[PDB]
Each structure stands twice: as C-alpha cells, then as structure tokens.
C-alpha cells in the first residue's frame, strides 16, 4: 500500500536508492542482452570483456562509440527526475538521498542527481591502459578515426582501426591506449566504491530498488544487510510477485515512482 510507504517516506532521514536497467530502459537505452538485443553479430556478453578488447579493440570501441552516440537522443525519464528533485528537496531539509546505480549511461547525472555511485562505471569516462588515469569524456566523436563509425546493422564493415588511432591518453609522457571505464564481464567492482556503499546502506533508514528486484544482483549484495537491520524496502519494476503476497509497485518506474516521491 502506497499510503503506508508514504508514511515511511516522510519519516526517513537517509534514503538510499538502487537503480537497475529498468530505468535506463524506459529512456529507450539499449542494453544488448536477451532476445534481439544485438549489435551487428554480437550481444554484450560477447564484447564487454577484457578478452574482446585485448583481441579486437577497434571493434569494441566501435561498439562503445555507438553507445556513446545513441545517448545524445535518449533523455532522462520522469523516474530519473523525480529522484533528482527528491534529492534536492530533501537535501535542503538536511535529509540525505544517495543513488547506487548499475547503469552507465549517466542519465541520473543529466537528471540533476548529485550523490550517485556508478558501480559499473560510465560510458563517458575513460581509463588509460598504461597509467590508469580515469578521465571524463563526452567528446563526439571521442576520436576522429571513429567518426561516424559503429553502425549497428549486422552487415556493417568493420572499421578495423589501427590501435594508435583509437583514443589515446592525452599525457604524452604516456599516450597509453584508453578503454571505456566500465566494468566488464569477469572484472571486479572497485572496492573503494563498495566500501562507501556499505557505509551508506548501513546509515540508511529506507531503501528503494528501482528497475530491478532485491532478489538479483546487484541489489542482492546488500538488501539483505539493510533488511536485517529492520529497514523497509520498496521495489519498483515491471516484475510481478505471486498472488499470495518490503513493498512492490508493479509498473513503469516512469509512472510508479514520481507520485511516490512528491
């Protein structure tokens, strides 16, 4: 029941909001996973790996160029905003709001969220393979060689770009090859971040799960910790729960959430 949720809402001083792919989906962002989530031949499992990058970096960067570019036309949905404005509203009252997101499209930032933790990184950050420097980057195209590349249709010609023309680290001391600062399959989450999040979750007195369920990664690393403290937890997603039954507001975040946070 919504009323009941809202009563907790008003009381809460430290809200933590975990956000999954559902919320990026509603802004039309592709995730390249499950049926018909394709980019040329591949799904993300195929390309989002250290091995793919080591093996064919041009191809991977093509993939990522595309993703960077299709972002120019996808905007934050109402859920992104309702969150951001919440954070703003409550911050003024000295109540905190933090965002822990597995999404890498920077939509929450563009919505005006501030206290955000991007635990899979971000398409608009690079990491130098040589020196390890992490830098913001929204340039379009990220490098000339990549101009108008990364077409999605299966039959596109590979651009087969020489490594030295792919994006390179601007400290010429170094000039290492840049990769997208994103967590790939088979890599580990930055532990500095996980510690911060642990801390935030420990501190929190109401927890929201949006566009994913507590039952799955990554919500499942934590929701158990917070729940075992007795803190209430609300899911918002397109999922269903069994006739015989934490709160759950089935439906699009875009619709479910803004009323919930007013």
């Amino acid at each position: 029941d919504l009323t009941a949720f809202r009563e907790h809402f008003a009381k809460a001083k430290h809200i933590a909001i975990i956000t999954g792919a559902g919320v990026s989906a509603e802004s039309g962002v592709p995730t390249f996973r499950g049926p018909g989530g394709f980019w040329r031949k591949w799904q993300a499992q195929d390309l989002a790996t250290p091995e793919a990058f080591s093996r064919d970096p041009s191809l991977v960067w093509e993939f990522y160029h595309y993703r960077r570019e299709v972002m120019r036309s996808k905007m934050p949905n109402p859920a992104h905003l309702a969150i951001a404005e919440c954070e703003a509203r409550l911050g003024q009252q000295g109540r905190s709001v933090v965002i822990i997101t597995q999404n890498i499209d920077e939509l929450h930032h563009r919505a005006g969220s501030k206290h955000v933790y991007e635990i899979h990184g971000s398409l608009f950050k690079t990491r130098c393979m040589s020196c390890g420097e992490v830098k913001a980057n929204h340039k379009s195209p990220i490098c000339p060689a990549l101009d108008g590349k990364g077409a999605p249709d299966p039959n596109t010609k590979e651009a087969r770009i020489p490594v030295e023309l792919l994006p390179r680290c601007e400290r010429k001391s170094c000039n290492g090859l840049l990769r997208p600062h994103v967590v790939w399959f088979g890599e580990t989450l930055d532990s500095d971040i996980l510690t911060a999040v642990e801390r935030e979750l420990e501190k929190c007195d109401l927890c929201l799960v949006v566009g994913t369920s507590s039952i799955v990664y990554p919500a499942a690393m934590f929701a158990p910790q917070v729940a075992s403290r007795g803190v209430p937890v609300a899911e918002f997603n397109m999922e269903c729960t069994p006739a015989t039954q934490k709160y759950h507001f089935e439906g699009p975040c875009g619709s479910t959430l803004p009323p919930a946070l007013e």
Binding site: V183, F185, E187, T188, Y217, P218
Partner: peptide, 8 residues
C-alpha cells in the same frame, strides 16, 4: 573483488 553478476 566481487565479480560483476558473480560470474554466472
């Protein structure tokens, strides 16, 4: 370090 989606 925690594996993205636990390595499933």
């Amino acid at each position: 370090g925690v594996l993205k989606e636990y390595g499933v």
